[PDB]
Amino acid sequence: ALPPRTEKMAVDQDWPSVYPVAAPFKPSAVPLPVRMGYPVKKGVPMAKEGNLELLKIPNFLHLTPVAIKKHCEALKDFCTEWPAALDSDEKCEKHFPIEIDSTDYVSSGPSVRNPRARVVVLRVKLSSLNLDDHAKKKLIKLVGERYCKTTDVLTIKTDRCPLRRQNYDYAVYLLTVLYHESWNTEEWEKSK
Amino acid sequence: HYVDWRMWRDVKRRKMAYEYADERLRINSLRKNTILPKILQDVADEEIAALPRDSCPVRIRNRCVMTSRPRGVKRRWRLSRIVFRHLADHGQLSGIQRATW
């Protein structure tokens, strides 16, 4: 008696009250007798209930479309506005030339220590600045693998410290110091 | 408490090369060099020539655990192709299959 919640389950029941948690397949708690397996010769797939293949699937039986809509309605919160600064990778850089990257990769195994969140680059568009009287001849030489033609992509990979936000802070401080020093160019910087 | 012996030899050699870190570090950093004085270079040479075995940092040969095989081994899975092939044949590895192109 007491079948595996297959025949005793009432018909037309509240399914959201069956798989609310992000649970696995659970071959014993699956009222879906799905047939899985390769045929033998000329007949029907193998077993009926939990199959080895069914478990080998990454397992997404949990959270059905109804539960998906429920989770979406739950996540409906957090509606922060976004500015319409015109895309095309032009006005966005004109507003703020710097373009820092603060990602959050996903870790594997039971360890969260992922040496990958320290990525940082101060990709500031110098063309958007456009306030260099004599610093044009100074910045072109004070950096090697930078200074393009169409758009000046000043991307000084500043990754010296063992973090990201303080790395960007130090990069901005160094850029400000360099700009202040270039405001009063040297004496032998003209002849190149 | 291993079953074979080559595994234990590799373990001992690797741990001896790792423990004595500063010595071999300075030796490898200062020996073969054309700059700076040669006094410290000769000192490191004498140190590495007078010390006994089970310490030199040149004791790294990729081997596996299931067989302890040095021939054909990769650092990605710390095991040999045979162990990798044995695990793939049982369908215990994701993405591995026959070269279907």
Binding site: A22, P58, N59, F60, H62, L63, I68, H71, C72, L75, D77, F78, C79, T80, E81, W82, P83, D87, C92, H95, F96, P97, I98, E99, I100, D101, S102, T103, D104, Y105, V106, S108, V124, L129, Y168, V172, Y173, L175, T176 | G72, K74, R81, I82, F84, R85, A88, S94, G95, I96, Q97, R98, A99, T100, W101
Partner: protein
């Protein structure tokens, strides 16, 4: 929401570049479909396609003892789906990634989200 309502200025996020990585085709397809569905439910205009695959077929023999005239390889039909969100806020993207990771596909179908801040220069 229940995240301590504050009044300080937020960080200007831009472009949530994502890149899924895996081996199985059906698993990656399911992951990208679920991601696109959730994004459309959130209301974010995005694009999707298929970048070039990256497969480094390592070397190995076909047998175990002695065999060279008959060799074999172990490749994979891996795929990638760049589910990048063009311009959006940081909190919404963070909550979205949290909901994703709360039940991500084991092994295959691993995402590599990436943002791009801005802030003021000096």
């Amino acid at each position: 929401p229940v995240v301590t309502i504050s009044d300080e200025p937020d960080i200007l996020y831009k472009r949530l570049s994502v890149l899924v990585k895996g081996h199985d085709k059906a698993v990656l397809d399911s992951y990208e479909y679920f991601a696109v569905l959730a994004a459309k439910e959130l209301g974010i205009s995005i694009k999707v396609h298929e970048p070039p695959r990256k497969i480094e077929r390592f070397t190995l023999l076909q047998s175990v003892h002695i065999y060279k005239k008959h060799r074999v390889q172990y490749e994979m039909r891996t795929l990638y789906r760049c589910l990048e969100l063009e311009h959006l806020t940081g909190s919404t993207a963070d909550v979205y990634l949290e909901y994703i990771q709360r039940n991500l596909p084991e092994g295959v179908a691993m995402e590599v989200t990436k943002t791009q801040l801005e802030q003021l220069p000096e």
